[PDB]
Design a protein around this nucleic acid. Structure first.
Lengths: 145, 59, 125, 72, 107, 72, 202, 97
RNA sequence: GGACCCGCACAAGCGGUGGAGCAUGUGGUUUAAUUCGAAGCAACGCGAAGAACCUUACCAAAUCUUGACAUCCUUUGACAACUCUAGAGAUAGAGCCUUCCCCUUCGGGGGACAAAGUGACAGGUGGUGCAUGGUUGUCGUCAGCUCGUGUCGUGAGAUGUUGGGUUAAGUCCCGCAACGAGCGCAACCCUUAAGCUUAGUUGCCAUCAUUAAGUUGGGCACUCUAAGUUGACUGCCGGUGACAAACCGGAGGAAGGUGGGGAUGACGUCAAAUCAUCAUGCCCCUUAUGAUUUGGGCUACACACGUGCUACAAUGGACAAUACAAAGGGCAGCGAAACCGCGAGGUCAAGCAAAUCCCAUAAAGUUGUUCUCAGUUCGGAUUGUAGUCUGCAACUCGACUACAUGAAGCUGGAAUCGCUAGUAAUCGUAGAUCAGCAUGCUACGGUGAAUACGUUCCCGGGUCU
């Protein structure tokens, strides 16, 4: 319940990228996640020519919802806090990077960041599906919890 | 069963059927061969304090 | 000329020495290329040279065993922070505001005799 | 490569020695004829070739379904 | 034997429950006496502050008596409708009650 | 390992003339040596003695897969 | 399920009943000590030994019995300890030395009163009278608390009850508190009655 | 030097021998180094708590065995004669090297 | 039925089970019995922390009757071991004396043995845990359960224990016919988290020579090792607080609110488990329901359920180089180095009864080369051949290695489990049992998360009404 945070990674100095490192690790291996994020960020730098934090911040705002349902006994479109917004955008970014069907994760997360910068793919389809579920139940309830 | 306790304290035909028992009871399984006692006699003689050994669970 | 701090985290103890120089971390007198696996994340151990940026000019020469590599590198951070405490006592608030000086008592927890893998209760049907 | 294009083909496998390779030991289905000849010579643990147990034991108690069916 | 609102907090007893309230006034005579043979810092700190709270509550909510050796032969109350539990024991102890009549209650 | 056949002298007596009836052994740990091909043993399977005939091909196998006791 | 405080307090405030190092042999030592205690339990039936502490020094054995009736192990001039020492020298093939120590407050050590409630309950007495006279005669000799629980077919019944008569402080969860404990079986004609005496001597 | 390996089970009986034999070699000799502690490593015995069922609750019994090294350099005839002469631990393993 | 609060009890997640193979356990079925127990949570990798023979009761055959064992009486007596014949061995039959150790005059007494009488007696892992002791799960580490004295009520019972507030807590404070006390909560106990004192060897190398090497010369600086100690208690400050408990935040500190964890499991419930650790009332068998030994058997299979390992791959497979540890074991044991082995392992053998020597390279990781989405370069199930180890011995029925075979399997239906931080996940290591044999159990480290707005709902428990 305090939810303490982690230090920024020194290559791209932001606090969001180390949380993305903590999301793409699997079974504890941090260095494999550091190998498949940094060469993926160099692949987005060699594909679309701009800074990697600039194209990452314009793609992480397209995955980030403003509404979410909360199922009860029904679905209430409650406004979500920005920490839940950024972990749900990171969770949809990793989990809809992982079902893409390509070869290596520096070609699989990198193309999903390049599709999420231009509003394409399965992460922004999950944000649009959460927005259709939040406008389909907007006239149902906006008061329960 | 005191047939098997008197049976296992004898020279056998092979050298590797000489097996291990508790030396006060006749329990065949879980005999600690540092002590040559079973699971319940080691607990009972450690709770009476008649073996050198402490209960401590701070491994 | 020699600031002997020590520092430990998570079964890994670092005996650092601070001699003045340009700056070169030699863990077991080798490098920081072959010893520490993460080339990028050796900035955990270069945190009291960047939080306390009065000077980033300190040769740390360090010979200790224990642990793995990451908690060993946080012990390099704890040894460099305790050696920067004993090098100058006015750095104490500057270390103490940014964490970096607690021996954090998270060690590897001790395995419970009912549970299978140290609070990994073995699957009720 | 040349090492991975010979493995699942019968005879030669994974740890073999190295257009000259057209000769040698029992690369063909004569090793399969040798294996069926050893199964025919054992048919006694040939009474356990209907079931799932070799000439060095298996303990079929819960799982011998490689030499059985799915449900049956 | 009685006050106004023996300073405050008339407890459930102290006349006809004497034999276990004798242990309380002998405990006040105990814990005044055992300060002098070694009280502070031969015990932990987390017993002596509630010992001082026990000495404070045994002279505050008890009131002002210490040498009550037996049952007194009368009561002297001022308020007999707040001290209804004080005026109910003396009819069972065969001792008279002397009190200032307040509204409707009588000693 | 090294093939034992600890009761070899039970067979080497009856080697001169024809093999008189059957021979009751109580040892399934004894291997078959290749000098009693043709002999008829009685292997104890736990319940009773089952007769076996050593033909030509079982000269590495012990007397234990012959006379089974697992039935069905 | 409460564990016993003669087992919880070894290595804490209560010393062991086996003070000898052994590294190599050890199971040929300890069982010898167990056979030594299976000779002393034989004399317990009359002379009421509480506990035996074996001090195996290097080759000789400083066996120290703690009995509450010391005149029935020591004889009239030293004869009964000498025949006890000769029978133990026969039955362990080492040198032994019977060091008897003389304890007072015989109704305050838990082996003596647990064995005493066992000798009362073998003689078809009532369990409530011997429990209440045990806790009052153990309180008037001076203690801080005695629990006494006897289980089994109480009074020759059919359903097994377990009744306890506690008075005073018996704080079993405080680790620095010297609590004596003993249990003793009583072989009655209606089975076995197991007593359990828990004395907190302050 | 001569090395003794003074070794016990509980620490209460090893400390009195460690202040006994060091002052015994100090009053009748010269230059004794003190009671050097060894790692004192233990054997942990984990048995089940119950009798028949119930492996889910178990009991742990460890056997701690403390060792103290005492080293005596440049010994006299007073050291070796009073070293094996003085004996009151009642429970430790005295080895003489 | 309500109010209120709390636990991984739901939500927020993360990783599994259920789908496949295999290991283990149970039920069903079967055989000569697949030994007997455990049966919703609280049975189902459990008694069993060691089923080839032994364990082993169960089962077939050959066998013995004061017996395999324990005590006492009589005769003899320092016991016997080792060879040979038969037998599957137990055992019978010879060779053969080991043949008074304490001791008296020759005859004795007698630690201690063998035979007979088969006498008393044994023996039973046979039955009932619904006769029992002892020991243990369970609600549940949940905060409850009560008593003395006094009061009220004709009583049974209530007060104390309730009402307000707070907490993990019947924790503490205030008010009060209650005042206290007991068991339980809390530490006192151990471990971990920082420094001092003490003491430096086998441990560590600052300063210097020095070598393959902290391995010796030197030193105990530091780490280390461990018996002492100081330290963490809401103790200081500020606010909210009835000016009281308590909460929230900050300083200081290595540690902040029982710091993290273990031990510790109240009164009792379930006629819960154990007559198979042991002891035991009663009943039963006592040329069998006792006993020895050989060979099976617990290690079966058309199936079902529970636990667990391995996978379904590219965050990966294979190959080459390279680093870092904690905890533990070792005397018939731990097996260095070196040689020969593709390899399991063997020949020879240094050192160590342990901070010395060995197990012991930890592996994941890092850096390269290669493979390029397939039932494959994934997996290694099944089966054949040849072997190694241990053991009088691998057939039922051990582990492992080599070569070949490469079967289902491409992230799993309803449902379901674990977990709030060094935790989940994943990777190896060590012990016990052990002649050999674990994917189980216990224990240790390496890397190491995301989350928890809330507590409305599903279960389980507690307080009052």
């Amino acid at each position: 319940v305090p939810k303490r945070d982690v230090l920024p990674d020194p290559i791209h100095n932001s606090k969001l990228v180390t949380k993305l490192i903590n999301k793409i690790m699997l079974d504890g291996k941090r260095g494999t996640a550091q190998r498949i994020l940094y060469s993926a960020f160099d692949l987005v730098e060699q594909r679309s020519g701009r800074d990697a934090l600039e194209v990452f911040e314009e793609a992480i705002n397209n995955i980030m919802p403003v509404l979410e349902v909360k199922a009860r006994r029904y679905q209430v479109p409650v406004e979500v806090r920005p920490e839940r917004r950024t972990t749900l955008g990171l969770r949809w970014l990793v989990n809809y990077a992982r079902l893409r069907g390509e070869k290596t994760m520096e070609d699989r997360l990198a193309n999903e960041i390049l599709d999420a910068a231009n509003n394409t793919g399965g992460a922004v389809k999950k944000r649009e599906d959460t927005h259709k579920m939040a406008e389909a139940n907007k006239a149902f309830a906006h008061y329960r919890w | 069963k005191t047939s098997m306790v008197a049976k296992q304290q004898k020279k056998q035909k092979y050298a590797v059927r000489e097996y291990t028992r508790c030396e006060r009871c006749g329990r065949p399984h879980s005999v600690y061969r540092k002590f040559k006692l079973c699971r319940i006699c080691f607990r009972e003689l450690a709770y009476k304090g008649q073996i050198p050994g402490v209960r401590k669970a701070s491994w | 000329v020699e600031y002997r701090g020590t520092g430990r985290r998570k079964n890994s103890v670092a005996r650092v020495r601070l001699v003045p120089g340009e700056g070169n971390i030699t863990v077991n007198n080798r490098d920081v290329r072959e010893y520490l696996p993460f080339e990028s994340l050796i900035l955990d151990l270069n945190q009291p040279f960047d939080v306390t940026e009065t000077k980033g000019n300190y040769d740390v020469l360090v010979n200790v065993h224990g642990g793995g590599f990451t908690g060993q590198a946080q012990a390099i951070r704890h040894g460099i922070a305790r050696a920067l405490l004993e090098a100058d006592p006015e750095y104490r608030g500057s270390l103490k505001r940014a964490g970096l000086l607690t021996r954090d008592p998270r060690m590897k927890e001790r395995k419970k005799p009912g549970l299978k893998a140290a609070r990994r209760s073995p699957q009720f049907s | 490569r040349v090492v991975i294009s010979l493995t699942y083909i019968y005879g030669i496998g994974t740890s073999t020695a190295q257009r000259e390779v057209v000769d040698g030991y029992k690369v063909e289905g004569d090793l399969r004829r040798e294996t069926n000849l050893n199964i025919k010579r054992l048919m006694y643990r040939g009474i356990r070739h209907r079931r799932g147990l070799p000439v060095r034991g298996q303990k079929t108690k819960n799982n011998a379904r490689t030499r059985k069916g799915p449900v049956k | 034997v009685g006050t106004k609102k023996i300073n405050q907090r008339w407890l459930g007893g102290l006349l006809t429950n004497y034999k276990t309230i004798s242990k309380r006034i002998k405990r006040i005579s105990e814990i005044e006496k055992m300060e002098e043979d070694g009280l502070f810092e031969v015990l932990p700190k987390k017993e002596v502050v509630e010992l001082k709270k026990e000495y404070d509550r045994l002279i505050k909510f008890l009131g002002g008596i210490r040498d009550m050796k037996s049952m007194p032969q009368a009561l002297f109350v001022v308020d007999p409708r707040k001290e209804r539990n004080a005026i109910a024991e003396a009819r069972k102890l065969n001792i008279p009650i002397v009190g200032i009549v307040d509204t409707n209650c009588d000693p | 390992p090294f093939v034992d056949e600890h009761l070899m002298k039970k067979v080497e007596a009856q080697e001169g003339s024809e093999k008189k009836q059957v021979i009751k052994t109580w040892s399934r740990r004894s291997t078959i040596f290749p000098n009693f091909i043709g002999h008829t043993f009685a292997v104890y399977d736990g319940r009773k003695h089952v007769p076996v005939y050593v033909t030509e091909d079982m000269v590495g196998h012990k007397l234990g897969e012959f006379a089974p006791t697992r039935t069905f | 399920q409460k564990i016993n405080p003669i087992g919880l307090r070894v290595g804490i405030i209560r010393d062991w009943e086996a003070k000898w190092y052994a590294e190599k042999d050890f199971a040929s030592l300890l069982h010898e000590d167990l056979k030594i205690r299976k000779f002393i339990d034989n004399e317990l039936k009359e002379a009421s030994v509480s506990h035996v502490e074996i001090e195996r020094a290097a080759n000789r054995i400083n066996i120290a019995i703690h009995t509450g009736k010391p005149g029935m192990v020591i004889g009239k001039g030293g004869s009964e300890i000498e025949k006890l020492r000769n029978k133990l020298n026969a039955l362990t093939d080492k040198k032994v030395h019977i060091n008897v120590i003389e304890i007072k407050k015989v109704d305050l050590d838990a082996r003596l009163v647990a064995e005493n409630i066992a000798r009362q309950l073998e003689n078809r007495a009532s369990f409530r009278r011997v429990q209440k006279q045990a806790i009052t005669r153990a309180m008037k000799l001076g203690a801080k608390g005695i629990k006494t629980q006897v289980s089994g077919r109480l009074g020759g019944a059919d359903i097994a009850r377990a009744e306890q008569y506690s008075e005073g402080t018996v704080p079993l969860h405080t680790l620095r508190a010297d609590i004596d404990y003993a249990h003793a079986e009583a072989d009655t004609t209606y089975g076995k009655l197991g007593v359990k005496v828990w004395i907190y001597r302050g | 030097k001569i090395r003794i390996r003074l070794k016990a089970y509980d620490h209460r009986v090893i400390d009195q021998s460690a202040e006994k034999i060091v002052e015994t070699a100090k009053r009748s000799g010269a230059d004794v180094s003190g009671p050097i502690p060894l790692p004192t490593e233990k054997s942990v015995y984990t048995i089940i708590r119950a009798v028949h069922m119930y492996k889910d609750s178990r009991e742990q019994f460890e056997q701690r065995t403390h060792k103290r090294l005492i080293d005596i350099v440049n010994p006299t005839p007073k050291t070796v004669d009073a070293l094996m002469g003085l004996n009151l631990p009642s429970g430790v393993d005295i080895e003489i090297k």
